Design a protein around this nucleic acid. Sequence first.
RNA 1: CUUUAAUGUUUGAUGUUCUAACGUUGACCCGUAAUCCGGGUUGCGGACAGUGUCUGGUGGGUAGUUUGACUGGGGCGGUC
RNA 2: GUUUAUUAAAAACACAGCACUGUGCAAACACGAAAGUGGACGUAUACGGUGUGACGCCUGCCCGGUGCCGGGAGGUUAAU
RNA 3: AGGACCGAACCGACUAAUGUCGAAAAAUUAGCGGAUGACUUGUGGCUGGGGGUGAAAGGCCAAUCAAACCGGGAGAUAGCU
Lengths: 149, 46, 77, 271
Amino acid sequence: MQVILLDKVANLGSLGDQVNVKAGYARNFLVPQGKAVPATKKNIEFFEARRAELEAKLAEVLAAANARAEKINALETVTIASKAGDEGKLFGSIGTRDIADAVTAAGVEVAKSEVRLPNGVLRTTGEHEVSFQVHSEVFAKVIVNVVAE
Amino acid sequence: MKRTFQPSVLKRNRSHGFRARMATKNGRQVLARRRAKGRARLTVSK
Amino acid sequence: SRVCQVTGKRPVTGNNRSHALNATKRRFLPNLHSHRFWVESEKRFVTLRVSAKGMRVIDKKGIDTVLAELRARGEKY
Amino acid sequence: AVVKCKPTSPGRRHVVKVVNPELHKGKPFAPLLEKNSKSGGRNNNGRITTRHIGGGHKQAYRIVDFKRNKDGIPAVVERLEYDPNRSANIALVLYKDGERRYILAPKGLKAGDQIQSGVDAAIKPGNTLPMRNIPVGSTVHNVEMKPGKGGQLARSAGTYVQIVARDGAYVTLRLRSGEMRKVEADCRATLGEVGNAEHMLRVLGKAGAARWRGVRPTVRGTAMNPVDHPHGGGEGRNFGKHPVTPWGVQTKGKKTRSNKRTDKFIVRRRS
RNA sequence: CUUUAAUGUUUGAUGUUCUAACGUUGACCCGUAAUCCGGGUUGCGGACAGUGUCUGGUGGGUAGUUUGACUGGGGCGGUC
RNA sequence: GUUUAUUAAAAACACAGCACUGUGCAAACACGAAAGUGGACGUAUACGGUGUGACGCCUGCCCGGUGCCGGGAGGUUAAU
RNA sequence: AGGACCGAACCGACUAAUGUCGAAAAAUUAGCGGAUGACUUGUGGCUGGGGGUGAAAGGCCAAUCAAACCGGGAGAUAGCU
């Protein structure tokens, strides 16, 4: 399927290139998320007219805003006190709900889907590293030290 | 010697009554056929 | 029923022939599936029971155009 | 306790009874009861779908709390009761907050025993904890397929499962059938073994005993005519055929599991 | 041409990971005084399962049929 | 105890018990073009199928053939 | 306590005789089995024909069952009377 790309696709993203893609890939991922628009002999003239450069800056500022946001908290440290068990066996596994809420209350205002946990769900008690992706090409590292209560 | 026919008004009406026929389309066709034949008694009427 | 909501494909009866040409009645069924299509005009997902051919039709045309035809058909989606 | 009754008359000679002196001698707790209309093996179409079902004593349904979601509330075992719907006895438990509930009774329970749920619970039998907090190698019962589903394994009298290994977020359990199944660590389980382990020692004695238990007589395929069963026919007990189900499927050693969806959670099969 | 090897091409089998199709007879909220159904949030599986078209195997579970004539009755045997 | 209402009440059928086999729960299986329902508001000390038929002594040898279960060296093998 | 014992109602039908254009399209008379249970019964529901139901006889499904009844294809076909 010949489609025009808006966002930077890591593999074949080139700002509106007539590059074939699987129908399922565009149908289920690109179009619903706004990363591309189906163009068939009608929007090509339109893309090169108003999408050619007008939205290029609009897309870029989103990346610039994301880069600004992820540096809001220079400390980049998260401390949460949990009533862990006796010698391990933390009370209960916690994912993104509590940590995101605490960070939002005091720290960086970020959405739920932004937080990614590469080291499980924080089972063991101690120091852990969490990779935050505010953009495809922007990755952030945050150290979390859960302390037993 | 118990015989096949053991009368019961409630069972007769609820089985072959007018409203029983109208419930289904097959019963409605039964009434339609008997109207065409001109039968005086459309169904078993109490 | 097994009716595509886009192309209108419905099961069609037919025969299946053996080596001895014996004929037995069969039925051909459309390749129907339940799919959710994202519509930007109304900003939500719409679930349609569409065939694989219909899904190709939706891709070739616009989802908005297909929805308009469905509305003109007079059947709720 | 297992008691052998004297053969005062035929039908009592082979009766072996199981008597539990601590079972409650009275009516059950009404608020937790519900009617249980029999079906006789018929489905919504009215046809017989399961054979050899019908009749039997009327029995009410006890709402047994399998989920055990009352976290952090200590509870006390009021009494043990006979449940007609289950092989295992149930226990009526009163929570500190004034709520009564029914739970399966493990082997160790007795009147006045203390039980607790939630992760912050002890290791004594009767407490329910997520399987992540349960030490490996312990015996549990009433295990959950999925978090919050309720509990489906080791529910009969004298049944249990073994926790053998814990990898990542999944746990491996050995079921009473000898099969190893992989389950999520978030699922809850109850420590200990289901009680009434002597329930298997009864013999029912006579034909009427199985009759008022809801079981109807079973007729052998050979005794039937050819038109009714794949077996049957001929003069003088002729079989000359491979054993099969009434609907033609080959029984006596043919595997019928065809799922391809839950196979990822099966580590070993029965042997 | 026989004998071998750097980058790029078609690639297909296998393996790992991901989520956005799809499944959910998991939980929670709403329509709603509702164990149906739908929508929403989340969890778990996940391109698997399942379904359509085509195709190999199995298939008395079911169906339609066939199972000759002569003959010192017929059958058996023999013959055509 | 049940059975050929209306020529057969029995040694037939059932039976408690016994064994084999299938089934991990969206269970096997059954009725349904499907939804769904029974199994079961049960889950392996449970459920379905099959044979034998209380209880006591027991139940020997044979895997060639046909089924069923497992294997993969090699050969043959459809659609495409 | 008991699918315990004897025995009426009640349920069933082992033997004999009568009756076979009968009082009766399976009965009567005299005996006979069970009779607190796998019992029996009233009322009302559910299962529909290649289907139901069946402690299994090819039994029963309105006096009809190795495929009910009614209408239709249909004036089926009949090398036979």
